[PDB]
Symmetry: D2
Subunit: 294 residues, 4 copies
């Protein structure tokens, strides 16, 4: 039986979602699940390797080792918040040669938001604003370059973090200077972009060959029909770093009728709307299909 | 043989000139070496041996001068959470070597966490009461997780340990407070929140040895007469951590007539007003007296 | 009833050890226990404050808040190992004005081993080697000063860590250089001291007015009679940073008959030998006595 | 108008002199700006605008020169875990700005974690086999907790990501391995362990564009003829991360006749031997050709 390690929080019972799924209608799939914080590993160039997972057995913490044949990463591999760095585990998994969704290569390169955004910048130069309306954004390697903004208000996004973390709205120059000094204390990079007075925002997702668009109506659901414009946004983004099996594009719709793409997320993208259960099943088949190629 | 005094301060002030002619016991001369924390390193041995190394430029080449200070005057901040502002190990090394200092190395070390210093002031307020020691209301958060709200707005949030306005922001409402806490998380350190004071002017009461002065500066200059009120503020504060030879107390004077003590500063306090020259001579006198005792 | 917060691992049931103890034979003591990693807090200058403890209730993680009237710290407040920094909690407790054993002031100043060692260096200059045989040791603020050792082998101790962590034996110059480069990666201070070929080592402890000496026979019990020589070692060390209620002195006995004091530990000192249960009871009375003064 | 080339390298080499006279399409001139990572900063905008700022000394004052490179040649390491050796955000910024480079910014970024690079070599060994690609046996540890033992001694432990011998130690036995792991914990990063090779000599096979050279250096120099064996090592490695215009493979030759590939280097590879001058001209040629394509 093939062993699948799924790195996600306990809320979703992936074992139950993969129950009965087989590779070539004959080989069974054993699902192992845990969060990055409860994992460790050792990998050898000769191919030998082990993944150690801390779990609870009869009220006591124990370590059980496994050897995944495949991995599904649903959690962020990196966050500049304390204790949120698991890049070394991603490196170890690649070192062990274990296949993954999304690919370990893409997961590693997704560990710096501005690095991913740089990929969108290139796509925007290539496609033009009409087809790919990337929001204006400025990147500062560190606080020394954060002197001013030519327009206000702007949204400052500090380092690499998720779920609203490290993000603030700045209304004037004096406050921008105060915020830049806070960036100094984070000792990392930051970006600034025009604040969009949004009527609503839109997220276009792509799991395998399945698409869905959702309208979400400052720091914040109804589904909407896919359009070829939306399809292009996510299709082109899904091509970076060798290809993203699970990804989505976030855009803000201004009260002036303009769209502004502000981010592309990877295999850790949250499932939203009234069809989350369906999305999990779609993820299962994609994983199953990917595992079949081995 | 002359007694060597190391002054840690920027070059602007020529302490050698100010100490020129000064003698210990009217016979022993004083040799003045001066450098900034960034130009220093050292090695100390439990047996008493040590060397304070000063990096200097010679014939366009980086060379090192080895000194054995008999005493040290510290005029720069020993710590800042901004990149490369950490000189705590030098303070540790100077104490390891047993070198006497102004202010004391013990107090300098304990002054490296603003809230730790504020904690002493909290104790003094509990003891003396509001009328005599009007300490501003303040809240300490070990980390961003406890920053949920503020009973009153606007507030001034001060992040970690930093100087010259760095990491200090004015928050006007609850939602903004939340966004600011999401950024505190990127600093990975503590923070405090205190009521924003609509000040009419702020006052700073300084004490150098036995010389007192008071200055009035009217959101981030006139000398005024000392009062027994002011004298009590600085006399009380000057006693913490075994005693501060040089220190000052900063208080904001609200428009409703209330005073709010917001900070106590050590030997790094900047010299201000039309008596800076006199203050420097006063420091010279204080140090020579401290040096005489050894 | 007075609330006592004991910060220690779960192995010891402090509630059971404090069961029945009363202040003035009438006031009861409610014992709360948890580790630094499961705690957080908020403190206000006006005296208001809360300590939040994460615990498990029916298999789920919950937060219950308390307001300790006193604290007993049996765990290290700082370790440079990942996620081992709880200095901000110690700062918060002092900010809230909560009494402790050992004192919060001493616990804070014990967060840098070389800073504590500097205190022993001063005691050695004062008492002399015959009475206080402090081991030779060299302090490096950073790796740039770690060039060589005049004798080998030596023991290199990196940064601030416990239970053998960060400590290695270096036999020659080339290896010393390799180790110094490792120090560069820790980006912190380090010390080097002669390697003692020890017949055995000795630890002299002092809990309140109770003393005990233990012989422990490279990186490693039988009790031994207190002597006035041993008593002097711990008595003098127990006086630093305003006084240590719980502390011990570690010394190595060379095969050449010389003793070498290498460290002084605080209220987190481990209980050893066949009288640990007794030591816990002695700790209880000291705490009870200390609490009675409030 | 001339095309601007920014060379990131130490001053020792005068790339302006080597590029002097070179022209793109025989008509367009090349302007050479040169600086070290430590002297650079930048700001990049999604709209294409950007500025690479070079700090320089003018009339004894620190001033900034703003440049807009059309291409960049990177000859220095972009990352080191030693204090202030982190220039990853500059690499991110140069890509954000869309500036073409040698080696590619993508490969430079992915080369910032030695084991991540080694993981690619692991893959190549699995594919080509030992006879053609003799990759040394190596073990990857995400952190110190998994470092428990080594099947064979002595071993060479390499900590985190650093250069010029930094963080690399030779361990001769099990107990020492444990002590070394206790220090890895202070580095708070990953480490690898590989068999110590009792080498007779080591070889480095380099590839600059289409020019190959091989050098023999006989525990931490003669040119030899290229072989199809050597050509295959560097040709294979030169293909990772989309292709390496400049790279080299380091292999240790054991006394038992076995070869052990221990490392692949990128555009920062030092120039060695009696053909350094020629190698520089070869790099000039390679860059001019890459610049011609734009
Ligand atoms: N330029 C902007 N103008 C207006 N609102 C913005 C802007 N950027 C972000 N926001 C708001 O802030 C929210 C959070 O920001 P964003 O989506 O960039 O970060 P995040 O959700 O923390 O990122 P991650 O996907 O890593 O979790 C957005 O969903 C949106 O409501
Ligand atoms: N609660 C407050 N209300 C209004 N203004 C404040 C308040 N706290 C600080 N300020 C203003 O900010 C200025 C600087 O803040 P503060 O003195 O606390 O820090 P700092 O100057 O950065 O510290 P340091 O003295 O270390 O350099 C004060 O002089 C005052 O003008
Ligand atoms: N100079 C030395 N010579 C020989 N052995 C030494 C020396 N220093 C330490 N050791 C050995 O290493 C052990 C651990 O070192 P040490 O006691 O200094 O650190 P630790 O126990 O990690 O400190 P902590 O008390 O913070 O837990 C000692 O108990 C002793 O066996
Ligand atoms: N397994 C090994 N056995 C014996 N010697 C080794 C081994 N690994 C490395 N060395 C020696 O150490 C030298 C330097 O190590 P290595 O090239 O791995 O790192 P480095 O030079 O620090 O890295 P970089 O190339 O980034 O600067 C090698 O040239 C070789 O002489
Ligand atoms: Ca988002
Ligand atoms: Ca101030
Ligand atoms: Ca010890
Ligand atoms: Ca090398």
């Amino acid at each position: 039986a093939r062993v699948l390690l799924v790195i996600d929080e306990p809320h979703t019972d992936w074992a139950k979602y993969f129950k009965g799924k087989k590779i070539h209608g004959e080989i069974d799939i054993k699902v192992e699940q845990a969060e990055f914080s409860d994992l460790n590993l050792v990998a050898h160039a000769n191919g030998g390797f082990s993944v150690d997972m801390e779990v609870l057995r009869n009220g006591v913490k124990v370590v059980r080792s496994l050897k995944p044949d495949f991995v599904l990463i649903r959690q962020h591999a990196f966050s500049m918040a304390r204790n949120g760095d698991y890049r070394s585990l991603v490196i170890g998994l690649q070192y062990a040669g274990i296949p993954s969704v999304n690919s370990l290569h893409s997961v590693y390169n997704f560990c710096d938001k501005p690095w991913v955004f740089a990929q969108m910048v290139r796509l925007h130069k290539k496609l033009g604003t009409e087809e790919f309306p990337l929001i204006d954004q400025t990147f500062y390697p560190n606080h020394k370059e954060m002197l001013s903004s030519t327009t206000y208000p702007v949204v400052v996004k500090m380092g690499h973090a998720h779920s609203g973390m490290g993000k603030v709205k700045v209304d004037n120059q004096h406050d921008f200077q105060d915020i830049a000094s806070v960036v100094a204390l984070t000792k990392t990079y930051a970006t600034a972009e025009p604040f969009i007075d949004a009527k609503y925002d839109v997220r276009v997702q792509k799991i395998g060959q399945n698409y869905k668009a959702y309208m979400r109506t400052w720091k914040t659901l109804e589904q909407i029909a896919m359009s070829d414009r939306y399809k292009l946004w996510v299709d082109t983004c899904s091509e970076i770093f060798g290809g993203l099996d699970i990804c989505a594009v976030e855009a803000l719709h201004g009260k002036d009728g303009r769209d502004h793409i502000i981010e592309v997320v990877g295999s850790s993208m949250p499932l939203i709307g009234d069809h989350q259960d369906e999305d999990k099943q779609l993820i299962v088949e994609l994983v199953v299909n990917k595992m079949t190629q081995a």
